[PDB]
């Protein structure tokens, strides 16, 4: 029998244990599942338009605070009066402002120029960031159609054009569709066809980070397999510069002097940031690039503070500690906190005490305290995400950035503990035994304090193999306009001339799987990085040299026509067989199908010239009984290659003997049947 | 142990079963936990307060 009570209850035990080993990893993946950040998008103060451009504004210590924008038609004269209490005046004489938020590409999306004119600059800079963060991740933005993909956008209600009551001259029905943050997450999920939760978050200076929290949750629950979190604060009006000045909180210089004694206000800046969030298991299983990992995010409120605007200390300590508890980590684990650093000599004191309480109380090494707003300015709903791009660039470059205007440490903060070192110099922050962790803090004017934990991506990417191949994979690119077609080859040429040594097959794979098929396509098969950057230098001007150019809107499925006679040369397929394994296998199969009925094996025939037969007193491929099998063999092998490279037929046309290939490749007859 | 051939592994199975119960109830108190509508307040049209 079964060795009574020793081979069953021990057999039932391994399943009450392993199911438990499986029902707990479910709780740990339902609550502490580390979500990956697949890709980065940012339009930040200054010249920053891409996540790699933000690093040489952040690593060499450049402040983005330059001045108020002039593109927007701002008054700029009633904004500044000597009387500080004059209604309609602003106190800050600058700030980091976007120089490209005024412009947009209407024809690129399904957007009319009039509708795009009615679109909020936040909502027009968010669609472009979504497209960028999808194209950065190797995920075709048109491939996510009717798929679960949440959109979580942090926003600030900003006055744009005329009163909705007064309507407009051209913007009558689209003015709501711009000046409502409602569609500021639904528009993105509509143009890209995303089906997951399109949620707009509004908690002011913490929105984006609160947003990513929600996105993180939507990943740790399984509602959406992917999320696009982040936040935008683009200012089309000086309105809150006028209004933040009335409470006397803006820094006259517009600079966020975070944790500095020379601070005279919290400053202001406009920006936008976007994170492509996916759970680590899904991110690595699908092959999506993992930059860093959001492990735990907490969102809390300041409670009954000293007013709605004043921050709270205990609530900040509670949210920073809750983020660590939900991430399963502790104070020491975080190697570099990048807290709000509002910029004022009131918020910074309170928040540094909270940092010293949640972190500095129990520290093994000095926590590297930083603030992105020092380099950029207070980006509000773009703050909470901008710090996340900072840290992710910090771990993808292995350096802890400076905090500008922080040489004079604040006298109102007790730094005598030494557990917190303000990042006034670039501290080397290399990969080591400890998983490199850090934490982003954002405390909004609404009182909602939020904190996220960013660990370095587990370094399991290492282990890739190397090889070489003769397959010249096409370098395919596409844009929505002819000028954009000439600009997607110039920027790629600039990238391959400024980032040299990137192997051509990697470039072809990234250009092919990761770029949407748009209705202006340029494609060339490179042989060298000098014969490709030359084509990319002719495609930038419009000259189609060594490439193929085409406008092909409303065209997705191809027909396979089969010509009959005409290539009497027949000295072609030798190279294809000698260089393509598929042509070296399908040809063998169809020949061995032809041999039982026609003894001629196409293999000796293949290795020859066009005048080979002429030497033996015979015209180029003239013997019908010997020629028809070889066209059939080469033809079916060519069709098999074309179907092996992803091109499948829609209809089939056979001129004279292409009917046999119609029998073979379309499944009507087998290789043996059609060969016979 | 002494009687038949199970006085130990039978307890390990019992606790393991109880834990699995207590960890599977955690899943259903984390994703499907009913959320009671403790109260409702409204200012809707028609003088409704």
């Amino acid at each position: 029998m079964a060795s009574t009570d020793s081979e069953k209850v021990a057999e039932y035990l391994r399943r009450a244990t392993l199911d438990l080993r499986a029902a707990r990893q479910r709780i740990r993946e339902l609550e502490g599942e580390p979500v990956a950040v697949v890709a980065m998008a940012c339009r930040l103060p200054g010249g920053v338009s891409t996540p790699e451009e933000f690093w040489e504004l952040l690593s060499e210590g450049r402040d983005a605070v330059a001045g108020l924008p002039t593109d927007r038609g701002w008054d700029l004269d009633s904004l500044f009066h000597p009387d500080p209490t004059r209604s309609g005046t602003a106190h800050q004489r600058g700030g980091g402002f976007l120089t490209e938020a005024t412009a947009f590409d209407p024809a690129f999306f399904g957007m009319s120029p009039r509708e795009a004119l009615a679109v909020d600059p936040q909502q027009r800079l968010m669609l472009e960031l979504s497209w960028e963060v999808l194209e950065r991740a190797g995920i075709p933005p048109t491939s996510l159609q009717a798929s679960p993909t949440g959109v979580f956008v942090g926003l600030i209600p900003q006055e744009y054009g005329p009163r909705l009551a007064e309507g407009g001259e051209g913007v009558e029905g689209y003015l709501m569709t711009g000046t409502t943050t409602s569609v500021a997450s639904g528009r993105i999920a509509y143009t890209l066809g995303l089906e997951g939760p399109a949620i707009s978050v509004d908690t002011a200076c913490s929105s984006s980070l609160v947003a990513v929290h929600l996105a993180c949750q939507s990943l740790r629950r399984g509602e959406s397999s992917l999320a696009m979190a982040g936040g935008v604060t683009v200012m089309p009006t000086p309105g809150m510069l006028v209004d933040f000045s009335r409470m006397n909180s803006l820094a006259p210089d517009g600079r966020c002097k975070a944790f500095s004694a020379g601070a005279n206000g919290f400053g202001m800046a406009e920006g936008a940031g976007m994170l492509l969030l996916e759970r680590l298991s899904d991110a690595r299983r699908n092959g999506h690039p993992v930059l860093a990992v959001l492990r735990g995010t907490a969102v809390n409120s300041d409670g009954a503070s000293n007013g709605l605007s004043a921050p709270n200390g205990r609530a900040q300590v509670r949210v920073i500690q809750q983020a660590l508890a939900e991430s399963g980590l502790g104070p020491a684990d975080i190697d570099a906190v990048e807290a709000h650093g509002t910029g004022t000599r009131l918020g910074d004191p309170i928040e540094a005490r909270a940092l010293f309480e949640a972190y500095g109380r129990d520290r093994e090494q000095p926590l590297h305290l930083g603030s992105v707003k020092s380099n950029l300015g207070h980006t509000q709903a773009a703050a909470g995400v901008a710090g996340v791009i900072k840290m992710v660039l910090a771990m993808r470059a292995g350096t802890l950035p400076r905090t500008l205007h922080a040489s004079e440490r604040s006298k109102e903060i007790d730094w005598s503990s030494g557990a917190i070192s303000l990042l006034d110099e670039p501290e080397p922050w290399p990969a080591g035994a400890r998983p490199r962790r850090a934490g982003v803090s954002s405390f909004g004017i609404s009182g909602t304090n939020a904190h996220a934990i960013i660990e370095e991506a587990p370094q399991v990417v290492e282990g890739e193999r190397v090889e070489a191949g003769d397959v010249v994979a096409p370098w395919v690119l596409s844009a929505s306009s002819a000028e954009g077609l000439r600009a997607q080859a110039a920027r790629l040429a600039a990238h391959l001339r400024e980032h040299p040594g990137q192997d051509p097959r990697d470039i072809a794979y990234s250009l092919a799987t990761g770029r949407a098929a748009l209705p202006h396509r340029a494609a060339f098969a490179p042989v060298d990085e000098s014969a490709a950057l030359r084509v990319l230098d002719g495609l930038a001007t419009g000259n189609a040299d060594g490439a193929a150019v085409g406008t092909s809107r409303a065209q997705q499925r191809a027909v396979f026509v089969f010509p009959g006679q005409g290539w009497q040369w027949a000295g072609m397929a030798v190279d294809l067989l000698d260089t393509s394994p598929v042509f070296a296998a399908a040809l063998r199969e169809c020949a061995d199908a032809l041999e039982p009925h026609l003894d001629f094996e196409v293999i000796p025939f293949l290795r020859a010239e066009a005048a080979r037969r002429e030497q033996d007193a015979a015209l180029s491929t003239e013997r019908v009984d010997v020629v028809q099998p070889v066209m059939f063999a080469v033809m079916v092998s060519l069709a098999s290659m074309w179907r092996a490279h992803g091109v499948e037929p829609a209809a089939v046309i056979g001129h004279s003997q292409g009917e046999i290939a119609a029998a073979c490749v379309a499944g009507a007859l087998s290789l043996d049947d059609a060969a016979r | 142990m002494a009687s038949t051939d199970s006085e130990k592994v039978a307890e390990y199975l019992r606790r393991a079963t109880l834990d699995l119960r207590a960890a599977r109830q955690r899943i259903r108190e984390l994703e499907g936990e009913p959320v009671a509508v403790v109260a409702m307040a409204c200012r809707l049209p028609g003088g409704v307060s």
């Epitope: 079964a2 081979e7 069953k8 | -």
Partner: antibody
Framework: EVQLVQSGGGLVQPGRSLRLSCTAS????????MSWVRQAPGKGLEWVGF??????????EYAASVKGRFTISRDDSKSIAYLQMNSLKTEDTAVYYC?????????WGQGTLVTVSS | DVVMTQSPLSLPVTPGEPASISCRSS???????????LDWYLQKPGQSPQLLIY???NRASGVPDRFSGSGSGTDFTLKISRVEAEDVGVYYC??????????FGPGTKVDIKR
């Protein structure tokens, strides 16, 4: 994950020998007791046999009908379980299943359709 | 002797309905451990069987919650809270008191009800 990939199909006549190989991937092979269960066409399961775990003696227990002929063996080093089918009669024309437990048949593998016809 | 078991061989189910499949055993499957030693199994149409429930009531990992098990030492009942196309097939009632296991029994033939 866990898989119980199977092999050993083919053609046999009444009075021949056959091999059913089960490869387990995902967990330690030595502490599970292998079992072979059969699917007669038209009905559900009937259990063929079970070998004890390596540390539980590794002794075998088959059904009276297939006692001896249907030998059950296993091995950890290459992690493989053998059902050697001997003198397959025409009542052995069935879908055999590699089960992951002497009393707890968990994964059931895939199922090999063994045919015994003249 | 042997614990020979019976079940509702031809129990019908319909989409959107909770179903109650049962098993009856001659002897008592409740061991001195206090744990019922019954197993519920599901065979899909033309696929490998799967282990739904062990020890009378508890799940196997990966088996949806839509199956629940209960019952006394003799009578055992599995309720499907919500039947679907994946909850169709053959349900096997397995005793773990005596193993030799000659056959799996008649099995409950489950079909979508019209």
């Amino acid at each position: 994950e866990v898989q119980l990939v199977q092999s050993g199909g083919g053609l046999v006549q009444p009075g021949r020998s056959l091999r059913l190989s089960c490869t387990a991937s995902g967990f330690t092979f030595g502490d599970y007791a292998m079992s072979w269960v059969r699917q007669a066409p038209g009905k559900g399961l009937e259990w063929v046999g079970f070998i004890r775990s390596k540390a539980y003696g590794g002794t075998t227990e088959y059904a009276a009908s297939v006692k001896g002929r249907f030998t059950i063996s296993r091995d950890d080093s290459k992690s493989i379980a053998y059902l050697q089918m001997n003198s397959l009669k025409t009542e052995d024309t069935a879908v055999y299943y590699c089960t992951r437990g002497g009393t707890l048949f968990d994964y059931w593998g895939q199922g090999t359709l063994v045919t015994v016809s003249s | 002797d042997v614990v020979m078991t019976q079940s509702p061989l031809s129990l019908p189910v319909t989409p959107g309905e909770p179903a109650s499949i049962s098993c009856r055993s001659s002897q008592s499957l409740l061991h001195s451990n206090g744990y019922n030693y019954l197993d519920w199994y599901l065979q899909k149409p033309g696929q490998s069987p799967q282990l739904l429930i062990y020890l009378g009531s508890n799940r196997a990992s990966g088996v949806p919650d839509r199956f629940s098990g209960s019952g006394s030492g003799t009578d055992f009942t599995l309720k499907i809270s919500r039947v679907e196309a994946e909850d169709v097939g053959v349900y096997y009632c397995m005793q773990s008191l005596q193993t030799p296991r000659l056959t799996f029994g008649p099995g409950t033939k489950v079909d979508i009800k019209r």
